[PDB]
Amino acid sequence: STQTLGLVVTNTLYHGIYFSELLFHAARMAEEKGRQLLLADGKHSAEEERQAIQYLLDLRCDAIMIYPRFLSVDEIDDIIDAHSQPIMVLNRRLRKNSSHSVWCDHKQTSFNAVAELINAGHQEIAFLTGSMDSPTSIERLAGYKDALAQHGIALNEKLIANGKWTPASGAEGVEMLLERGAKFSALVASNDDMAIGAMKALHERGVAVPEQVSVIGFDDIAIAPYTVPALSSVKIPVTEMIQEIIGRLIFMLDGGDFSPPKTFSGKLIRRDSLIAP
Amino acid sequence: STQTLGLVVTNTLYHGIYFSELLFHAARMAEEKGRQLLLADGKHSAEEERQAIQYLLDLRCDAIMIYPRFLSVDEIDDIIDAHSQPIMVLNRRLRKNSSHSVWCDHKQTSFNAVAELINAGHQEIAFLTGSMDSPTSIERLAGYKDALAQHGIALNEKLIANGKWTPASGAEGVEMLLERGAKFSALVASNDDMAIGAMKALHERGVAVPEQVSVIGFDDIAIAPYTVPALSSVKIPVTEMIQEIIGRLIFMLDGGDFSPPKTFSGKLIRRDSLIAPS
DSSP, rough: OOOOOEEOOTTTTTTTHEEEEEEEHHHHHHHHHTTTEEEEOOOOSHHHHHHHHHHHTTTOSEEEEOOSSSSOOOHHHHHHHHHHHHHEEESSOOOOSSSGOOOBOOOHHHHHHHHHHHHHOOOOOOEOOOTTHHHHHHHHHHHHHHHHHTTOOOOOGGGGGGSSSSHHHHHHHHHHHHHHHHOOOOESSSSHHHHHHEEEEEEEETTTTTTTOOEEEESTTTTGSSSSSSOEEEEEOHHHHHHHHHHHHHHHHOOOOOOOOOBBBEEEEOOOOOOOO | SSSSSEEEEEETSTTTHHHHHHHHHHHHHHHHHHOOOEEEOOTHHHHHHHHHHHHHHHHTTTTEEESSSSOHHHHHHHHHOOOOSSSEESOOOOOSSGGEEOBBBBHHHHHHHHHHHHHHOOEEEEEEOTTOOOOHHHHHHHHHHHHHTTTTTTOOOGGOOOOSSSHHHHHHHHHHHHHTTTTOOOOEEESSSOOOOOHHHHHHOOOTTTTOEEEEEEOOTTTTTSSSSSSSSEEEOOHHHHHHHHHHHHHHHHOOOOOOOOOOOEEEETTOOOOOOO
């Protein structure tokens, strides 16, 4: 051991609070356990993310933590197999070395939130995706589909619009949906930023929220109760996920007592933006 | 030299984008220049922030960067005097070793924004502060007072309410202003989060924005043009400040040609939330 902890900086600053919380807690744990915290720049590709892991392995960090934007889960499994130093993965699910990853069931989480809309009487529900290549975005669209299929609703492909996680893309998403004449009493945006953009575009086109269109988001950002109307959103337990990944790492390095690996999912917080049609 | 760069993690993640941007660019520079980037936890006091600096100095980082929440500017000046390794300070103004600090004139920035409200015809202007012990919040309230004084308006202390940088505290701010019967056609929140909270409380009390009350904030967050109405806000050039602090540090360690040290200020972006009364 070198008494050294590694963290890959990825292009995920501002994409929820995952990275900054990971950073905060990893800094805290490193100081408490008396080890050095090293940063590596993962830059802007899968190869560069791998290089950043490799650089920390070469300097012989006892452990490495990463929330990967480009580097696939399968490639990381291979790196974990090749090295005795634990590589911890946040917000992804590893197939082989699953105890090295802490994840949230974004598919089931989306399902449940869409199911609550159906149970409140919404039959025609629009969906605004995040980025096409985003694992979380793929899972949230899957959960939406799965919820429609299990409640006997036919998949209307007109009701699904592409987004980019940004407020602009949320406004554009509504703009697209209204132009192709899609009809809906509810809209699910894949994050709160897109939802606020969606609500803005709906307001500017004379569509009442929640009276005509109910709106939900994901993230439960601090701003959400203070929108007009107050934004219903799915809270993800990010802090608990971070505490889980740190605790799991402490055990892998130092031992001590064991805690049964938790699984995580979110919950919809109903607010003024969601009613029954 | 050990080819090592130090960064103090402080209680300032989510307090604007200062620390996150600093971390990004410090990570990039360290990789480009082939040096290791070390983190130290500055925790939750002035003493703990000093300890973090000391820990990095003891490990012999060539340089240390910090955005200090608790640790005084005068104390940091002393530490810089005692050590040959550059300690760089973001978003604070050092009195003696001023080339080690990159700062924004938050007082003048606030002044200018409040001056634009006066020049648009607002005479009674409410103010929501950030935290009492925040340097930026002190500076912004000072600029507000300075603007009222120079445009011949009497300081009405009833128009000033305490806040905590959060959306809740912005709503509470409006609540307290309305209860003590303060009259205003404009409101300045010290950040966008407070402004959105303020606008929510104003809407729930039947006060029209911008028709009755114009609202401005600070930060220019990505959400701002998508609020109802679109939030006018002061944009701080954070990214230029970070490039400035990194550029200075490159010169101090590796040498070369430098840009003459800049100083920085923000400007108000006018949006739908701001008009001319009545």
